[PDB]
């Protein structure tokens, strides 16, 4: 039980503050590739934006053969998320708490945790 469990159980009227702030953050970087997020609930589930964001935050071009740009199955989406998690750990982050499947399943708490830990680590990336 972390602060995200406390947030959803005890202060759920503050979720909008978290959402907005993480949206601004992801868009600051994703906008460099002409990409945009309006909705954290759905738009990270296929793993594509999460992979590209790692390239953006650690400062490398992610080769397209290393993932699924247009995932057509649940398993291909899982593999994208697993690959972004791998790149997070390559950057020094500890193993994400959620399963890759939780992200594909649009679990919002899981999506918030992943994005917040990027937010905290990469706060200073211009």
């Amino acid at each position: 039980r972390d602060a995200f469990d406390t947030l959803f159980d005890h202060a759920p009227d503050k979720l909008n503050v978290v959402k907005k702030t993480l949206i601004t953050f992801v868009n600051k970087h994703l906008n460099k590739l002409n990409l945009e997020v309006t909705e954290l609930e759905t738009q990270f589930a296929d793993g594509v934006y999460l992979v590209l964001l790692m390239g953006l935050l650690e400062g490398y071009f992610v080769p397209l053969h290393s993932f699924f740009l247009t995932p057509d199955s649940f398993e291909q989406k899982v593999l994208n998320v697993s690959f972004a998690f791998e790149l997070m750990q390559d950057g020094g982050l500890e193993k994400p708490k959620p399963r890759p499947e939780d992200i594909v399943n649009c679990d919002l708490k899981s999506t918030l945790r992943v994005l917040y830990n990027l937010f905290t680590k990469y706060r200073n990336v211009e």
Partner: peptide
Amino acid sequence: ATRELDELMASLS
């Protein structure tokens, strides 16, 4: 925006 998220997360911890 940014500070408010940090403050919130800290107070929930």
